[PDB]
Protein backbone atom coordinates (compact mmCIF):
# COMPACT_ATOMS: atom_id res chain seq x y z
CA UNK A 1 0.00 0.00 0.00
CA UNK A 2 0.93 3.69 -0.68
CA UNK A 3 -0.30 6.54 0.97
CA UNK A 4 0.47 10.03 -1.01
CA UNK A 5 1.68 13.12 0.92
CA UNK A 6 1.39 11.43 4.12
CA UNK A 7 2.83 13.29 7.29
CA UNK A 8 6.67 13.43 6.99
CA UNK A 9 6.79 10.66 9.68
CA UNK A 10 5.23 8.07 7.98
CA UNK A 11 6.85 8.18 5.09
CA UNK A 12 10.35 8.55 7.23
CA UNK A 13 9.38 4.95 8.50
CA UNK A 14 9.10 3.04 5.50
CA UNK A 15 12.24 4.90 3.49
CA UNK A 16 15.85 4.15 3.80
CA UNK A 17 16.42 7.96 3.32
CA UNK A 18 14.83 11.67 4.22
CA UNK A 19 13.19 13.59 2.35
CA UNK A 20 10.29 11.64 0.45
CA UNK A 21 6.18 12.10 1.62
CA UNK A 22 4.54 8.85 0.77
CA UNK A 23 3.91 6.30 3.02
CA UNK A 24 4.20 2.60 1.87
CA UNK A 25 3.20 -0.41 4.25
CA UNK A 26 1.84 -3.52 3.92
CA UNK A 27 -2.72 -3.32 3.73
CA UNK A 28 -2.45 -5.47 7.05
CA UNK A 29 -1.62 -2.48 8.48
CA UNK A 30 -2.28 -3.59 12.18
CA UNK A 31 -4.85 -5.17 11.59
CA UNK A 32 -5.71 -7.97 14.67
CA UNK A 33 -3.61 -6.35 16.45
CA UNK A 34 -4.28 -3.51 19.33
CA UNK A 35 -2.48 -0.61 20.95
CA UNK A 36 -3.10 0.70 24.52
CA UNK A 37 -2.64 4.55 24.75
CA UNK A 38 -1.83 5.64 28.25
CA UNK A 39 -2.16 9.78 28.21
CA UNK A 40 -4.67 12.44 28.53
CA UNK A 41 -6.90 9.72 26.89
CA UNK A 42 -9.01 9.75 23.41
CA UNK A 43 -11.36 11.16 21.85
CA UNK A 44 -12.76 8.09 20.13
CA UNK A 45 -15.46 9.82 17.97
CA UNK A 46 -12.91 11.45 15.43
CA UNK A 47 -13.76 10.08 12.22
CA UNK A 48 -9.92 9.49 11.47
CA UNK A 49 -10.45 6.67 14.18
CA UNK A 50 -13.33 5.33 11.95
CA UNK A 51 -14.43 3.06 15.30
CA UNK A 52 -11.43 1.56 15.96
CA UNK A 53 -10.52 3.46 18.94
CA UNK A 54 -12.37 3.38 22.56
CA UNK A 55 -11.70 4.64 26.66
CA UNK A 56 -11.49 1.54 28.48
CA UNK A 57 -9.77 3.27 31.63
CA UNK A 58 -9.69 6.42 33.56
CA UNK A 59 -8.56 7.51 36.89
CA UNK A 60 -10.14 11.01 36.96
CA UNK A 61 -14.11 12.34 36.95
CA UNK A 62 -14.25 12.35 33.21
CA UNK A 63 -12.72 9.78 30.07
CA UNK A 64 -12.69 12.22 27.59
CA UNK A 65 -9.66 13.68 26.57
CA UNK A 66 -9.75 17.86 27.48
CA UNK A 67 -6.13 18.28 26.49
CA UNK A 68 -5.87 16.67 22.69
CA UNK A 69 -2.15 15.10 23.60
CA UNK A 70 -3.66 11.50 24.30
CA UNK A 71 -5.51 12.26 20.82
CA UNK A 72 -2.48 13.36 19.18
CA UNK A 73 -0.58 9.74 20.23
CA UNK A 74 -3.37 7.95 19.14
CA UNK A 75 -3.25 8.84 15.90
CA UNK A 76 0.08 8.43 15.14
CA UNK A 77 -0.56 4.98 16.02
CA UNK A 78 -3.66 4.33 14.22
CA UNK A 79 -5.86 7.05 12.81
CA UNK A 80 -6.70 6.32 9.18
CA UNK A 81 -4.47 9.69 7.26
CA UNK A 82 -1.66 9.98 10.74
CA UNK A 83 -1.08 6.65 11.37
CA UNK A 84 1.38 3.92 11.08
CA UNK A 85 -0.94 1.15 11.62
CA UNK A 86 -4.56 1.77 10.54
CA UNK A 87 -6.60 -1.18 10.97
CA UNK A 88 -5.39 -1.94 14.64
CA UNK A 89 -7.45 -1.25 17.80
CA UNK A 90 -6.86 1.89 20.08
CA UNK A 91 -8.04 1.06 23.41
CA UNK A 92 -7.35 4.88 26.02
CA UNK A 93 -5.98 4.65 29.38
CA UNK A 94 -6.48 8.27 31.07
CA UNK A 95 -3.86 8.34 33.99
CA UNK A 96 -3.16 11.92 32.65
CA UNK A 97 -5.45 15.02 33.31
CA UNK A 98 -6.05 17.21 30.85
CA UNK A 99 -3.26 19.37 31.67
CA UNK A 100 -1.41 16.63 30.94
CA UNK A 101 -0.19 15.74 34.69
CA UNK A 102 -0.55 12.52 36.32
CA UNK A 103 0.53 11.36 40.25
CA UNK A 104 3.05 8.39 39.38
CA UNK A 105 0.95 6.15 41.43
CA UNK A 106 -2.31 6.41 39.30
CA UNK A 107 0.44 6.30 36.33
CA UNK A 108 1.20 2.59 37.73
CA UNK A 109 -2.05 1.86 38.21
CA UNK A 110 -2.75 2.27 34.51
CA UNK A 111 0.14 0.18 33.57
CA UNK A 112 -0.76 -2.53 35.57
CA UNK A 113 -4.58 -2.71 34.55
CA UNK A 114 -3.24 -2.49 31.03
CA UNK A 115 -1.17 -5.72 31.91
CA UNK A 116 -4.72 -7.35 33.14
CA UNK A 117 -7.03 -5.69 30.44
CA UNK A 118 -5.48 -7.30 27.64
CA UNK A 119 -6.86 -10.57 28.73
CA UNK A 120 -10.61 -9.03 28.40
CA UNK A 121 -9.77 -7.86 24.64
CA UNK A 122 -9.61 -9.93 21.13
CA UNK A 123 -5.57 -8.80 20.10
CA UNK A 124 -4.75 -12.36 18.41
CA UNK A 125 -1.87 -10.32 16.44
CA UNK A 126 -0.16 -8.81 19.71
CA UNK A 127 -0.82 -6.30 22.34
CA UNK A 128 1.06 -2.84 22.50
CA UNK A 129 1.40 0.18 24.95
CA UNK A 130 2.60 3.72 24.26
CA UNK A 131 3.58 5.56 26.65
CA UNK A 132 3.88 9.31 25.99
CA UNK A 133 4.75 10.31 29.46
CA UNK A 134 7.63 10.60 32.32
CA UNK A 135 9.23 12.06 35.30
CA UNK A 136 12.06 11.74 37.18
CA UNK A 137 13.61 8.21 38.43
CA UNK A 138 11.38 6.08 40.54
CA UNK A 139 11.89 2.38 40.81
CA UNK A 140 8.16 1.46 41.29
CA UNK A 141 7.17 3.49 37.78
CA UNK A 142 10.35 1.47 36.11
CA UNK A 143 8.87 -1.61 37.78
CA UNK A 144 5.30 -1.17 36.93
CA UNK A 145 6.56 -0.86 33.13
CA UNK A 146 8.41 -3.64 33.42
CA UNK A 147 5.27 -5.99 34.73
CA UNK A 148 3.48 -4.80 31.95
CA UNK A 149 6.30 -5.98 29.43
CA UNK A 150 6.52 -8.97 30.89
CA UNK A 151 3.25 -9.97 30.75
CA UNK A 152 3.17 -10.16 26.93
CA UNK A 153 2.55 -6.23 25.97
CA UNK A 154 5.24 -4.54 23.92
CA UNK A 155 6.03 -1.44 25.29
CA UNK A 156 6.96 1.92 24.22
CA UNK A 157 7.73 4.65 26.32
CA UNK A 158 9.00 8.42 25.92
CA UNK A 159 12.97 8.59 26.33
CA UNK A 160 11.68 12.60 27.81
CA UNK A 161 12.11 16.01 26.38
CA UNK A 162 14.57 17.26 28.37
CA UNK A 163 18.14 17.42 26.15
CA UNK A 164 19.55 15.12 28.88
CA UNK A 165 20.52 11.43 29.47
CA UNK A 166 17.26 9.42 30.58
CA UNK A 167 19.18 7.67 32.70
CA UNK A 168 17.38 9.92 35.11
CA UNK A 169 14.11 9.45 33.79
CA UNK A 170 11.13 6.44 34.17
CA UNK A 171 10.02 4.71 32.45
CA UNK A 172 12.28 6.05 30.28
CA UNK A 173 15.60 4.20 32.11
CA UNK A 174 13.63 0.51 32.37
CA UNK A 175 16.12 -1.70 30.57
CA UNK A 176 12.94 -4.09 29.74
CA UNK A 177 11.28 -1.86 27.93
CA UNK A 178 11.41 0.01 24.77
CA UNK A 179 12.92 3.78 25.15
CA UNK A 180 11.96 5.58 21.96
CA UNK A 181 14.01 9.67 21.58
CA UNK A 182 13.08 12.00 18.72
CA UNK A 183 14.26 12.89 15.20
CA UNK A 184 13.46 15.66 12.82
CA UNK A 185 12.66 15.64 8.96
CA UNK A 186 16.41 15.85 8.53
CA UNK A 187 17.50 13.25 10.56
CA UNK A 188 19.16 15.00 13.39
CA UNK A 189 17.90 14.31 16.43
CA UNK A 190 15.27 16.64 17.63
CA UNK A 191 16.79 19.66 19.92
CA UNK A 192 14.60 18.59 22.72
CA UNK A 193 15.39 15.16 22.68
CA UNK A 194 16.91 12.72 25.39
CA UNK A 195 19.55 10.34 24.77
CA UNK A 196 21.58 8.13 26.91
CA UNK A 197 22.44 4.51 26.66
CA UNK A 198 19.00 3.52 28.07
CA UNK A 199 17.79 4.34 24.65
CA UNK A 200 16.50 1.79 22.27
CA UNK A 201 14.89 3.51 18.78
CA UNK A 202 14.80 7.07 17.43
CA UNK A 203 11.60 7.64 15.54
CA UNK A 204 10.34 11.06 14.12
CA UNK A 205 9.26 13.48 16.84
CA UNK A 206 9.70 16.98 15.44
CA UNK A 207 6.65 18.40 13.62
CA UNK A 208 4.73 15.52 13.67
CA UNK A 209 0.86 15.74 11.94
CA UNK A 210 -2.22 14.10 14.12
CA UNK A 211 -5.82 14.32 15.28
CA UNK A 212 -6.45 16.46 17.97
CA UNK A 213 -9.46 17.06 20.15
CA UNK A 214 -12.76 19.20 18.78
CA UNK A 215 -12.40 16.86 15.69
CA UNK A 216 -9.20 18.28 14.33
CA UNK A 217 -5.80 18.16 13.29
CA UNK A 218 -2.32 19.22 14.92
CA UNK A 219 0.93 19.47 14.55
CA UNK A 220 3.43 19.08 17.77
CA UNK A 221 6.61 17.98 18.93
CA UNK A 222 8.28 15.73 20.94
CA UNK A 223 9.36 12.33 22.14
CA UNK A 224 5.26 11.52 22.88
CA UNK A 225 5.23 11.91 19.52
CA UNK A 226 7.95 9.30 18.19
CA UNK A 227 6.75 6.79 20.63
CA UNK A 228 3.33 6.23 19.02
CA UNK A 229 5.67 5.39 15.55
CA UNK A 230 7.22 3.00 17.59
CA UNK A 231 4.01 1.54 19.04
CA UNK A 232 2.69 1.33 15.93
CA UNK A 233 5.24 -0.23 13.72
CA UNK A 234 5.12 -2.77 16.40
CA UNK A 235 1.57 -3.57 16.26
CA UNK A 236 2.14 -3.50 12.41
CA UNK A 237 5.23 -6.28 12.58
CA UNK A 238 3.43 -8.09 14.52
CA UNK A 239 0.21 -8.30 12.36
CA UNK A 240 2.56 -9.18 9.98
CA UNK A 241 4.25 -12.43 11.82
CA UNK A 242 7.66 -10.49 12.21
CA UNK A 243 8.17 -10.45 15.68
CA UNK A 244 6.24 -10.55 18.84
CA UNK A 245 5.39 -8.63 22.18
CA UNK A 246 8.80 -9.58 23.87
CA UNK A 247 11.10 -9.31 20.75
CA UNK A 248 9.74 -6.47 19.25
CA UNK A 249 11.96 -3.64 20.02
CA UNK A 250 14.60 -6.15 19.88
CA UNK A 251 13.90 -6.29 16.18
CA UNK A 252 12.43 -2.86 15.49
CA UNK A 253 16.56 -1.99 16.50
CA UNK A 254 17.89 -5.02 14.36
CA UNK A 255 15.89 -3.88 11.20
CA UNK A 256 16.12 -0.23 11.89
CA UNK A 257 18.37 2.27 9.58
CA UNK A 258 21.60 2.44 10.99
CA UNK A 259 23.89 5.44 11.76
CA UNK A 260 22.40 7.84 9.39
CA UNK A 261 21.00 10.47 12.20
CA UNK A 262 23.46 13.70 13.47
CA UNK A 263 23.87 14.90 16.75
CA UNK A 264 23.33 11.56 17.83
CA UNK A 265 26.09 11.76 21.86
CA UNK A 266 28.51 9.49 21.61
CA UNK A 267 27.14 6.51 23.18
CA UNK A 268 23.41 6.40 22.65
CA UNK A 269 22.02 4.34 20.07
CA UNK A 270 22.23 5.86 16.11
CA UNK A 271 18.83 3.68 15.14
CA UNK A 272 15.72 4.98 13.26
CA UNK A 273 12.77 2.80 13.22
CA UNK A 274 12.56 1.44 9.96
CA UNK A 275 9.42 -0.78 8.70
CA UNK A 276 11.63 -2.62 6.19
CA UNK A 277 8.73 -2.71 3.59
CA UNK A 278 8.73 -3.84 0.20
CA UNK A 279 6.29 -2.30 -2.06
CA1 LIG B 1 16.00 -3.39 26.26
Redesign the pocket.
Known amino acids: AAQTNAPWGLARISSTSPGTSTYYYDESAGQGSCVYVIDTGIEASHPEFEGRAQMVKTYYYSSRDGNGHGTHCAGTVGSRTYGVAKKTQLFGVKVLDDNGSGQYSTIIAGMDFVASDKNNRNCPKGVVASLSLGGGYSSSVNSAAARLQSSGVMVAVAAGNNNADARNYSPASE????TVGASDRYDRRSSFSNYGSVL?IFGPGTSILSTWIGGSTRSISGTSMATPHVAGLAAYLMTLGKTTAASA??YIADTANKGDLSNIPFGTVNLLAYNNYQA
Open positions: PSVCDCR
